[PDB]
Amino acid sequence: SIEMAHSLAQIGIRFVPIPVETDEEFHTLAASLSQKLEMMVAK
Amino acid sequence: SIEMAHSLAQIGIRFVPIPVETDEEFHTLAASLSQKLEMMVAK
Numbered sequence: 595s596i597e598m599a600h601s602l603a604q605i606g607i608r609f610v611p612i613p614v615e616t617d618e619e620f621h622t623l624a625a626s627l628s629q630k631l632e633m634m635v636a637k
Numbered sequence: 638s639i640e641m642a643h644s645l646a647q648i649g650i651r652f653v654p655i656p657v658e659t660d661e662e663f664h665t666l667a668a669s670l671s672q673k674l675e676m677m678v679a680k
Contacts, residue, residue, distance in 0.1 A: 596643075
C-alpha cells in the first residue's frame with residue numbers, strides 16, 4: 595500500500611506517518627525522511 | 638501492517654513516514670500527527 599511505510603517496518607524502524615498538504619511540503623518532508631534515515635544508519 | 642499508515646491512505650491523505658528513536662519522541666510526534674489531522678479536517 596505505502597512503499598515507504600512498508601520498507602521502514604520491514605527493517606524494524608518505528609515511524610509516524612505525518613500528513614502533507616503541499617507538494618513542496620511533501621518533497622521537503624520526504625527529503626527530511628531520507629536525511630534522518632541516513633543519519634540513523636550512519637557509521 | 639501499519640494501522641496509522643493504512644488509515645491515512647484509505648481516507649485519501651498523503652503522508653511521510655518519519656522515523657523515531659525515542660519513546661517520548663514517538664508519543665510527541667504521534668500527538669503532532671493527531672493535532673495536524675484534526676486541523677486538516679476542521680470545519
